[PDB]
Design a protein around this ligand. Sequence first.
Ligand code: GLC
Ligand code: GLC
Ligand code: CA
Ligand code: CA
Lengths: 682, 678
Amino acid sequence: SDLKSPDGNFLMHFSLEADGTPVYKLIYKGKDVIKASKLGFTLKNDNKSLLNDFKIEDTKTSSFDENWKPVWGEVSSIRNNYNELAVSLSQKETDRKMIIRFRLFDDGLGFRYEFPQQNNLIYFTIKEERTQFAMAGDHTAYWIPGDYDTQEYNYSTSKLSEIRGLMEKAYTKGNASQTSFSPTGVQTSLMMKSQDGLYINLHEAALINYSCMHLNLDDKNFVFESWLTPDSHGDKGKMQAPCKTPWRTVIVSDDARNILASKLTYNLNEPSKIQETSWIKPTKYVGVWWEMISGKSTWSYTDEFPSVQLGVTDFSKAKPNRKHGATTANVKRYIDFAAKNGFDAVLVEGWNEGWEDWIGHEKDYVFDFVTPYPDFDIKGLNEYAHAKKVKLIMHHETSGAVRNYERHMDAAYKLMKQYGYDAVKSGYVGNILPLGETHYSQWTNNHYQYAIEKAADYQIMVNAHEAVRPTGIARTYPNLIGNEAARGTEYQAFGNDRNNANHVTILPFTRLIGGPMDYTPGIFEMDVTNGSHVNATIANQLALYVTMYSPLQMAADFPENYERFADAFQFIKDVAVDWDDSRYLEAEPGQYITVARKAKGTDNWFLGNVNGETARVSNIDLGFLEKGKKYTAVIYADAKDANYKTNTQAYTIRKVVVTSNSKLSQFSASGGGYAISFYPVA
Amino acid sequence: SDLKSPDGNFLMHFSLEADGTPVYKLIYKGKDVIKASKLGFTLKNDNKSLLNDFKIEDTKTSSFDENWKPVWGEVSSIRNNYNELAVSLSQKETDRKMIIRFRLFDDGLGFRYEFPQQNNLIYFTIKEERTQFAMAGDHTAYWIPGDYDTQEYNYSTSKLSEIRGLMEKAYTASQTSFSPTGVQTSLMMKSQDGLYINLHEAALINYSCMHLNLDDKNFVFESWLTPDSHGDKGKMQAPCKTPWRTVIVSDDARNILASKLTYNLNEPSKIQETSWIKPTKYVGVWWEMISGKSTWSYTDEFPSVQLGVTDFSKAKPNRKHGATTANVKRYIDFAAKNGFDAVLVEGWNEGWEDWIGHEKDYVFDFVTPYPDFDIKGLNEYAHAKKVKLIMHHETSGAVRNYERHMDAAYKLMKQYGYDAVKSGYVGNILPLGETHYSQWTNNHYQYAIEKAADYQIMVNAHEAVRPTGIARTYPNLIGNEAARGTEYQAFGNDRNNANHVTILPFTRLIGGPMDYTPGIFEMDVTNGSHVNATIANQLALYVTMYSPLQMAADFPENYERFADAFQFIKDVAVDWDDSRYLEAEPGQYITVARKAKGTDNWFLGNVNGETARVSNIDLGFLEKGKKYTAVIYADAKDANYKTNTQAYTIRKVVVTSNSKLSQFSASGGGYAISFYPV
Ligand SMILES: OC[C@H]1O[C@H](O)[C@H](O)[C@@H](O)[C@@H]1O
Ligand SMILES: OC[C@H]1O[C@H](O)[C@H](O)[C@@H](O)[C@@H]1O
Ligand SMILES: [Ca+2]
Ligand SMILES: [Ca+2]
């Protein structure tokens, strides 16, 4: 009945109500974090469902404590240490079996349901999951609207009781694809902060063969309930026993830093299924990208036609619109910039026929993922890159046409291998075809998984924009080196409200739980070609290489902008992308994050701070340094009058020798931050 | 504005109503066959649509007369001869362009719509096509219920005015009807004054399958296309065009069956080298399962199976399994002994335990044999006897699952020397809400055929959309079922009406051959169902149900028992330099003689409906001044599809082009004749 974390700080009580409803409760340092919360499912075409009338048939406890080494990560080694309670239930009248498995870590709780092979539950359909998380009160939440098709929203900070009233404002419209569901519906990872100072995160782990979980708030009693994503037919999981749900996670601490530090989500995913992983490479890149995003260049080659039909349109005879970004000459310039500056790769978007019709047409045969435009020399460019020790990153926008991508996928991945591409950035902009499907159903989640597994067979890394938000599956498939799956830097170029200045102080407490984000930091020119204003300072942009953890790190700006601020650019050149250790020094969701990281295979550290709406002086504890050593520190900081709105390019650079006993104090501006390199003195 | 067939028997008048609605009319030998009929479309999210307010902006006429050689067919050479009127319309207010292209042949009319590249119509969605066929009167029709998911119905013969009343009875895994007066195409009719009229379509590509909805007050049919999973009836992008709509008409029913208009309206072959495409006579491990004797499944030990998890090597064999090495070898031996090309095997691969009723995604992998099926040995044994196996790919409606496995499956075929596959789509197309005949699913069938062609594989697709002549363009599509086949003779209920095979050639076969699986000699099968035919009927089907792919569906035992009758099945060819329909009346009888390709040999079959009848035929198709040995395989005088199915006679006689034959055919009976030069 009762389960504890290994350190004893968590207690989880499992019971049955009089009517056989399974309920759990969670206590942290003697305080309620999850009050009495019901568990189970409403099934389609089933009067009784799996909501009640259970009896406990068996319970089993055990303990686990091992370490494992990630391929890439924030630390060289991760501890997986929990106590487990497995409750075997049996329903009266139907005699159907459901197991509820709980794991309690020093970071909090994971639980899932399991259906063993049995006689009276075989094929079934989940109409709604009925998993609750009853809150102790009217917490502050850091939240985005519940949506079946996009996560690309600015966060709101409010009380639970205020979500309803804010929902209309927070639910910004005119995304390529978006579908809300409730006036009090929110996505996960959801971050909260109680009245009395607990940090509480609700999420899930190992989202496989199952629909993405959102949460619906009952704002009278402060109870969240699992709200899964409907497929094209309205169903919320076509199941076959033996089978099991993803884990539901409640990560909790009285120290916000421990939320960020937690590996609980990854610990609840299966160990790596990739045996030899040396082909998987953390990457720093530039690309022909922001040019199109910020309105200077096009993905398209020609404007001559009302629409294009691949295999019918003859691109070699079309009039070039002369705006195309992905020309041989332009791609060479980025390759030269990358090779000069120690970057691993160059993304190119708009390389392939079809871009004329990429957005908003609900077009099936939109791309073939193989045919270059006439002005992009695929063979020449990949030879030139390889001779300078650089690779191109393949881009496979699907524009929502999932079958079309599946049918081209093997030829596309083979083209990659033929030219020495080893990573692909995929996308899913637009409604999923055929219309009525959603981005995060069981069905579409299966496609993202299938793309990842097939890529693994080719030794290809995947970075998937507009896919379902991650849930720790990179442990199992470390070739998943990124997703977007949240509001990235691209929105800083899309006008409207761009990104809130404190955006990057929330993403780590929400979106980053489950896996890294391809955020595309490093903007130095904030007033871009199409008039949009990037809401950040240069030093904020440098800090992101540490504060937005990822094995895949873009420097998104143009070569000429980096040339203009070459001194600041040094930090982007110096910073690592993979780490033997990470130490969160300060963190408060929506306000600030400060973190230092030790570059893998070295004694070097890199630190960043990102700061929200309120300018703030931080006092930096340098005790993470090694004792007895002196380090050359270079501090890239906001000038005292820097500001994300009106003074974005004002920064200072200074060098100072420090030890583990040195204290540092630094002003960060509004939407600002700072970055620091530390190299031992020789 | 006016168009005529090359022979002058057809006149087609195109006009616009006062309000700009485009209308057509068709006249055959001075008699109205299509009265004034509207054309155009209702578009989704479009107030004006494409119904009216057109003006004729241009017209263009031309003529075409060429011959082409089919890879396989009823004749060695086919004439494509038509006059064309292309009417270029322009809508007021919108300025949108729509071309209506008409081709008028001696056999009747084809027309389609085309949208040229234009600035004010690019991406659009068809909510309903509004193509009409206004009838001259209350014709007799030979029809099946309109359905988005199956065509596996018995035909009904009735007046147009009686369809409504009969529809409850005619609508008796996956089926969805749509109207009390909805019917499928090809739809066959006969007017009270004796005209035979067929409505159908050709070149169903990148478009939704057309049904017809009858207004039974004014006798007007109107295109009713198949909705996709989102309810839509065509996601279109200009430049684009519809399939052709066809009105095949003659005062002689035999000309309907002879017509090649359907194929003539499809693009010429896109397969350059075609010698790998081989008309095929086959047997198979098949009827055993369909007639309740054997299973597709290997084990009954488990409530359900999960491929890659269930260990079939350790499961208890149910021993009912049809597709064992030993059983397959029996059929291989039988085929090689009897000069058959191939053996179909169903149930060879893991997953059959859950094939039906579960709406299961990962249902098959199309590659993993059961433990009792030695794939390598069996294909070597077959090839050593100069026989091939035919691959079976039931998808159970899980289309994405088939698409994902399709390259590896086609490679496995190539690896073991399979060159033909029988595919299936039993059950609801996944995800639920999709239909079998939507634009979306039709795309998949086409994709499977074009991909097969890249691998030099032939396709025979059960439960696919019914054909529309696409085999001219992709002649590796050597069959579909896509209608009620012989399997229904084993499923109890009403089985197949005795006159079924006298209607299919006037309906289903327009557009492409059917894998009907004839040749049943034992009509009272293991599960108690009664096949409604005589033996001589079954022999005639090798000629009267035209197909490059011909099964002898019964068990080897049963053929051995009636070895004398079996000789016809062994002798008959499967590809033809000429065909002559000698007698034909829909729902009553069909008699046809075909000249085996490359030879001076002929084969004739008659099939006969509910009413016993004496057939009286002239053998003047034979070459003049030569003598032939004829063997006539016929019903005994007391044969009967219900109570005396195995009573047949065999008689030999020398004939010439001046010989006449008179031959009794029983109820649900028929006769078959071989003709070899002296
Ligand atoms: O593929 C075109 C674009 O699609 C999406 O908004 C991606 O997030 C973006 O990074 C990419 O450039
Ligand atoms: O694949 C299983 C069965 O499916 C369908 O009913 C077919 O038409 C039949 O020939 C086949 O045996
Ligand atoms: Ca995006
Ligand atoms: Ca069938």
